[PDB]
Design an enzyme around this catalytic site. Structure first.
Site, PDB file in Angstrom:
ATOM      1  N   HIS A  81       0.576  -1.706  -0.161  1.00 44.11           N
ATOM      2  CA  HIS A  81       0.508   0.437  -0.317  1.00 44.11           C
ATOM      3  C   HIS A  81       1.258   1.625   0.107  1.00 44.11           C
ATOM      4  CE1 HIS A  81       0.237  -0.546   4.192  1.00 44.11           C
ATOM      5  NE2 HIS A  81       0.255   0.918   4.216  1.00 44.11           N
ATOM      6  N   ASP A 118       0.922  -8.274   2.358  1.00 47.62           N
ATOM      7  CA  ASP A 118       1.043  -6.692   1.879  1.00 47.62           C
ATOM      8  C   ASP A 118       3.163  -6.451   1.803  1.00 47.62           C
ATOM      9  OD1 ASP A 118      -0.483  -3.775   3.466  1.00 47.62           O
ATOM     10  OD2 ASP A 118       0.511  -3.820   1.346  1.00 47.62           O
ATOM     11  N   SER A 173       3.732   2.161   8.640  1.00 47.43           N
ATOM     12  CA  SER A 173       3.275   1.775   7.356  1.00 47.43           C
ATOM     13  C   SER A 173       5.065   0.683   7.099  1.00 47.43           C
ATOM     14  CB  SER A 173       3.422   2.235   6.716  1.00 47.43           C
ATOM     15  OG  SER A 173       1.575   1.949   6.236  1.00 47.43           O
TER      16      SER A 173
END
Ligand SMILES: [K+]
Length: 216
Positions: free
Chosen positions: A51, A93, A169
């Site tokens: 992402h 991810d 992240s």
């Protein structure tokens, strides 16, 4: 996300020990700046989430990385621009980012010592770990270490009870030996935070795409 266990410390001497490869990321899209984290694992390679890579909208030159950043406009090793992106083929991810050398013809994995990856043979529930990166609720570009325990392990997924916020992240997850065991992706409000666990499948993927990656 913020959880009952909110235990975080600021790292001021970022080039000491295993902290050097922890990296601050800025994706400068024309619509705004996306902030994130990551970790250097090879001469020209770094790991982060899918992402974060998607925020570039297909253009890798929009992704800039500053290893060992101490605070806003204080980057001891300068910055590097991405040139190629490779996403993990599984559900995890996870993504690999390759960078071109800087103005001084230096490589991202030469100005800093790449992190060591764990074989995860002894990793288990209830062990103490740390997730280190750049949280967005703190001053811009400051490195913070978050402490907690592993609460869930299954397949290529891992969960823990420590706190993180937008900006974290792609932060590396370290065990007591200071080896990377996973890559943080985010969490669910009031429930948990999780990461991609580097098991056999993920390990084979990384070795096939990164020639100089180092597994303990
Ligand atoms: K070179």
């Amino acid at each position: 996300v913020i959880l009952p266990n909110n235990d975080r410390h600021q790292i001021t001497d970022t080039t000491n020990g295993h902290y050097a490869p922890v990296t601050y990321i800025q994706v400068e899209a024309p619509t705004g700046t996306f902030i994130a984290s990551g970790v250097v694992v090879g001469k020209d390679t770094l790991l982060t989430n899918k992402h974060v890579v998607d925020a570039t909208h297909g253009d890798p030159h929009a992704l800039k990385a500053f290893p060992s950043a101490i605070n806003q406009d204080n980057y001891p090793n300068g910055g590097f621009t991405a040139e190629q992106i490779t996403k993990y083929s599984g559900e995890g991810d996870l993504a690999i980012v390759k960078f071109s050398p800087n103005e001084q013809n230096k490589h991202i994995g030469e100005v800093v010592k790449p992190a060591t990856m764990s074989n995860n043979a002894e990793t288990q529930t209830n062990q103490n770990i740390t997730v280190t990166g750049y949280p967005g609720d703190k001053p811009v570009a400051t490195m913070w270490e978050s402490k907690g325990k592993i609460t869930y392990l299954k397949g290529e997924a891992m969960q823990y009870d420590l706190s993180t916020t937008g900006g974290n992240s792609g932060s590396p997850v370290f065990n007591e030996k200071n080896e990377v065991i996973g890559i943080h992706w985010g969490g669910v409000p009031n429930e948990f935070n999780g990461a991609v666990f580097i098991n056999e499948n993920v390990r084979n993927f990384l070795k096939q795409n990164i020639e100089d990656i180092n597994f303990a």
